[PDB]
Each structure stands twice: as structure tokens, then as C-alpha cells.
Design a protein around this ligand. Structure first.
Ligand SMILES: CNC(=O)c1c(-c2ccc(F)cc2)oc2cc(-n3ncnc3-c3ccc(B(O)O)c(F)c3)c(C3CC3)cc12
Length: 552
């Protein structure tokens, strides 16, 4: 079966698109090599269309069915509740795409009778009709990158009214079920620090550890009708209200398995027979499906004492080594199995015998030292993309503030602390916008966050050590330095000088601003201050990427 069928109608933009890096008076202070930063646009949609369009074949063996049975048995212990219209409404982001039927996100959030009425009618229709394909909009995402150009990723999503209904039927399910089914393997339950702790303990729990990342080629497109029905069969194992069961059956048949694709101008672009990137179940479904195929493939490959870590289409396995030559062979068998299950790799997996050499989600484990000189493990990543996005956000206001999310998630890193914090706090100071709440994304979910709360947020997430890490590894230092030269970003010494100023300015403001000065920029002074201790329950429960989820 073909992932997509196309009519030849173009994937069209809904507004003005910019590909070239906007430049203002601040731009040069961060980044000089402007021509290396670009944004994807609808102009490259055609290229993406070719990539995501292929035939899927699937061969399902006993290992696959064995694992599925196990997953279903765990899923049967889950009790999930229906959300009320109001509850689902409050989970809708302020700037979420408006409905075609005469109301928008703010109407939904305010429980306006027009919105509520339509939503009830969508719900009723879901309950009564289990067959009629539901319309979706196909759009080209506008995302920023550094050269070496990627074609635009595609987003497929249904009407606002349907999205509120998804929340009603499935929000509790997708929030609770994956952890129960996958246990410690479910990657969205961990903060970055907890993730590192899990990886380290896991690595040490093997006598002779080996590990690898496995990255599927165009995972969404590899998801078949079977996979999506199998996901549904798992959801349906839950203790559910009858109404919820029907809605989940309906949504699966009418939306999740496939449907017609319509562009922004209302033209039929074609038909989808794979994973929709812009539905509530996208994260949960990809994670379950990846876990299922990978667990089964582990058994086929006879890997010993396998510990898996899975989030969305991203997968890492740590296991007991059987020797270099044996391990290499086992991975080929793993890859063969995965491919038979419709999930071939983009790049072949490689066994690693050092935790820090394993790369996944563009990230790796690295080591620094705390104030006492004790070794502290932390999550870092290549800073190229974050820095390119920071440059764009320097000159343009964007819906998602990647710099803020990056500072939160990668707070312990040399690059987040020295460059991102220094730069954006300077900007915020100059505009007196420190108290202004900003939208950002945490594991696909949108939060509104005040920059002045960063120290508190960082302490809670990463610990107090995040503010005093030093003696970074030569490898990490060199990667950062190299990236800086590549992008024409000033060297770290300049940022140290700038941070001293930013710190001083912050301290002068007093209050919460002063605390930002104290904790965020303690690294910038010679004679360090004594750093002592200075809501977040929903933050690291589940993945909601593409799921249209918002929180306060
Ligand atoms: C199986 N992979 C892992 O569990 C991860 C390793 C990892 C694991 C093992 C290893 F050896 C090296 C790195 O490092 C990671 C870093 C992240 N972080 N950390 C900050 N931000 C992200 C991130 C990444 C992607 C997305 B996405 O668009 O859905 C997102 F929203 C946020 C995550 C986040 C849960 C997704 C997972 C892992």
C-alpha cells in the first residue's frame, strides 16, 4: 500500500513565507554568516512529497504477536476517563488554528456557545458515524536550519472541532497508557536529568555494555493501516466509558488510519494511508509502534538483557555485549527484522561501547564537574540548530520561542549558559520584557513561561549544579567552538565578557531579576557567590508533539 496518493494540486501556504534570515540591529552580535541560516517553505513541498511517498510491505511473525499480547495485557490495567468539553477546551492553545465553521481558539478557550455547540455536534457525529473519512489540512512547516537544504516537513491536521473531540476521547489515554505499557522504556516520562540518570544506571547494570541508536527512515510514512489498527486495539484494552470506546473506534476508522488531504485554498491534494503528523495520538502511536517493532526485533536478533528507550520514532537500545563481531551481526538481524516490520533505517545502526558516543534526538550524554569537583553527567546536543533558530528569533517574533525551550532543557550545557542566556537576557533587559510571558514547547506541549522564573525552573529540573558546572570535556568544548566558527558566532571569551555586563545589569534591577543575575550568570564571575536553594507535575508525563496541547 502507498503511503500517499497525490492529485497534483500544490501544497499551498496560508500566509507570507520567509526563507532568508531576517536581519536587524542585534543580528551581527550573535551570528555573522547569515547565508547559512534558512527557513523551509511550501516551495520545497514537492521535494518532500517524493520522499514520503512509497509502498509499504509488512511481514508479521510470532515475536511481533508475542510482544503485542504482552503490551495489551499491561494496557488492560489502565483506567482512562473521558474529558468534559470544558476540560478539553482549556487544553487548546490560544493561537491554535481556527475552525472552518466560524470560530477560533480563543472562542474555544472562553467556552463560547458557538464553539461549544459545534464541538457537541462533532462529538455526536463521531458517536453516530464510524465510516466517513474526516477531512484534513496539509501544510508545509516553516522551520529554521543551518545549511548542510532540507525540504519542508509536512503537517497533516483536522479541524479545531475534531481536535477538541480527540482530547475528550483520548487525552487521558495518551497521557497514562504509554508509561503503563512500556514502563521505564517510555522516554517522555523523564526530565533531561532523569533521562541521563536512567541511561547511566542502565549502562552500569550490564556486565559488558553495548548500545545503539536506531533511526527509521521517514517513520510517519512507514506506519501502516495495520499498525494504526493495532494501536487502537491497545487503547481499547483500557477500562473506558462506552462513549469513549465508540469515539476512539470512530476516530481510528475516519481519521487516524487515513483520509483526504486538502490544501489551505480548499483543493484536494490527495489521500493519506499513513500516520498523520498533526493528531493527538501521533506521539503515543509512534512510540507504541516503535516500541512494538523494536522489542520484537530484539528477540529476533537474540540480543541479551535488552533495555530500550523509546520516544516517538526515536529509539535507543542498551544490552549485554556478546563481543564486537557478534554484536555487529546481531544488529544486522535487528535491522532485517525492523525492515520486515516496514521500518528500515535511514542510516544503518552502529554498536557503541561508550555511552557518550550514542547519539539520539541530536543529543548525547556528556560529563562536566560541579563546585566540589565531582563528575556530573548531563544531556547536551549539537548547538548548530539552536543557534540558527536563536538568530532568526533575534530579528523576528515567532510562535514558538526555541531559545527559551533550549535554555530550559539544555540549561547545564556550555552553549546554553554562555551564549543563549547571555544574548536573550540582554535583549529582554533592553526592552524591559523580563516579566513578559513567552510561548514555548516542552516535549511537543506548549507552555507560557516568564523568563524571570528560569532559575526556579532550572533548579527544579536539573538541580543547583546546573549553575556551577565547569571543566567541560574537550570534545564538547571543541564541538561548540567549531560550531561558533562555522556560523560566525563570536568566541566564548566574548560571551564571558558580555555575561559580566548582563549579570551586573540584572543585579541592579533587584528582585527576581537579581536572582536571574545571581544564579544564571555565576559562571561569569571570578569570585563565585554561594548558591543555595531558591506546579511542574504535568511537564514530564507524556509526549504531545503535533497534539495541539497547551498548559499554564
Ligand atoms: C530515545 N531517545 C532518547 O531517549 C533521548 C536522548 C538520548 C538517549 C540515549 C542516548 F544514548 C543519547 C541521547 O536524548 C534525548 C533528548 C531529548 N530532548 N532533550 C531536550 N529536548 C529533547 C527533545 C528531542 C526531540 C523532541 B521531539 O521534536 O519530540 C523534543 F520535543 C524534545 C528527548 C526528548 C523526549 C524527546 C529525548 C532524548
Amino acid at each position: 500500500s502507498m503511503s500517499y496518493t497525490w492529485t497534483g494540486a500544490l501544497i499551498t501556504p496560508c500566509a507570507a513565507e520567509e526563507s532568508k534570515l531576517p536581519i536587524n540591529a542585534l543580528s551581527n552580535s550573535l551570528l555573522r554568516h547569515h547565508n547559512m541560516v534558512y527557513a523551509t517553505t511550501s516551495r520545497s513541498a514537492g521535494q518532500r512529497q517524493k520522499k514520503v511517498t512509497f509502498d509499504r510491505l509488512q511481514v508479521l511473525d510470532d515475536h511481533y504477536r508475542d510482544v503485542l499480547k504482552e503490551m495489551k495485557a499491561k494496557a488492560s490495567t489502565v483506567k482512562a476517563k473521558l474529558l468534559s468539553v470544558e476540560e478539553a477546551c482549556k487544553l487548546t492553545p490560544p493561537h491554535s488554528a481556527k475552525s472552518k465553521y466560524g470560530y477560533g481558539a480563543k472562542d474555544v478557550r472562553n467556552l463560547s456557545s458557538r464553539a461549544v455547540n459545534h464541538i457537541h455536534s462533532v462529538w455526536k457525529d463521531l458517536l453516530e458515524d464510524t465510516v466517513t473519512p474526516i477531512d484534513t489540512t496539509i501544510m508545509a512547516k516553516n522551520e529554521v536550519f543551518c545549511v548542510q537544504r532540507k525540504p519542508a516537513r509536512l503537517i497533516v491536521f483536522p479541524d479545531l472541532g475534531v481536535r477538541v473531540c480527540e482530547k475528550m476521547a483520548l487525552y487521558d489515554v495518551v497521557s497514562t497508557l504509554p508509561q503503563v505499557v512500556m514502563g521505564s522504556s517510555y522516554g517522555f516520562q523523564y526530565s533531561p536529568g532523569q533521562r541521563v540518570e536512567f541511561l547511566v544506571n542502565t549502562w552500569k547494570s550490564k556486565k559488558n555494555p553495548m548500545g545503539f541508536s536506531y533511526d527509521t527512515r521517514c517513520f510517519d510514512s512507514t506506519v501502516t493501516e495495520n499498525d494504526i489498527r493495532v494501536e487502537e486495539s491497545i487503547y481499547q484494552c483500557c477500562d473506558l466509558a462506552p462513549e469513549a470506546r465508540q469515539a476512539i473506534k470512530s476516530l481510528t476508522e475516519r481519521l487516524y488510519i487515513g483520509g483526504p488531504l486538502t490544501n489551505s485554498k480548499g483543493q484536494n491534494c490527495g489521500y493519506r494511508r499513513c500516520r498523520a503528523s498533526g493528531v493527538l495520538t501521533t506521539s503515543c502511536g509512534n512510540t507504541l509502534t516503535c516500541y512494538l517493532k523494536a522489542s520484537a526485533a530484539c528477540r529476533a536478533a537474540k540480543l541479551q538483557d535488552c533495555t530500550m528507550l523509546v520516544n516517538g520514532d526515536d529509539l535507543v537500545v542498551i544490552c549485554e555485549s556478546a563481543g564486537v563481531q557478534e554484536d555487529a551481526a546481531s544488529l544486522r538481524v535487528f535491522t532485517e527484522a525492523m525492515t520486515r516490520y516496514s521500518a528500515p533505517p535511514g542510516d544503518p545502526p552502529q554498536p557503541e561501547y561508550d555511552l557518550e558516543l550514542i547519539t539520539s534526538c541530536s543529543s548525547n550524554v556528556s560529563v562536566a564537574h560541579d563546585a566540589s569537583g565531582k563528575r556530573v553527567y548531563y544531556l547536551t546536543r549539537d548547538p548548530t540548530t539552536p543557534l540558527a533558530r536563536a538568530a532568526w528569533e533575534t530579528a523576528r517574533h515567532t510562535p514558538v520561542n526555541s531559545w527559551l525551550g533550549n535554555i530550559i532543557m539544555y540549561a547545564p550545557t556550555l552553549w546554553a549558559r554562555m551564549i543563549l542566556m547571555t544574548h536573550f537576557f540582554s535583549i529582554l533587559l533592553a526592552q524591559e520584557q523580563l516579566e513578559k510571558a513567552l510561548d514555548c514547547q516542552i516535549y511537543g506541549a506548549c507552555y507560557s513561561i516568564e523568563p524571570l522564573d528560569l532559575p526556579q525552573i532550572i533548579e527544579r529540573l536539573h538541580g543547583l549544579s546546573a549553575f556551577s558546572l565547569h571543566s567541560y570535556s574537550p570534545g564538547e568544548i571543541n564541538r561548540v567552538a567549531s560550531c561558533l566558527r562555522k556560523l560566525g558566532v563570536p568566541p566564548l571569551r566574548v560571551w564571558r565578557h558580555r555575561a559580566r555586563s548582563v549579570r551586573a545589569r540584572l543585579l541592579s534591577q533587584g528582585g527576581r531579576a537579581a536572582t536571574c543575575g545571581k544564579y544564571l550568570f555565576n559562571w561569569a564571575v571570578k569570585t563565585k557567590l554561594k548558591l543555595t536553594p531558591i506546579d511542574l507535575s504535568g511537564w514530564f508525563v507524556a509526549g504531545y508533539s503535533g497534539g495541539d496541547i497547551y498548559h499554564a
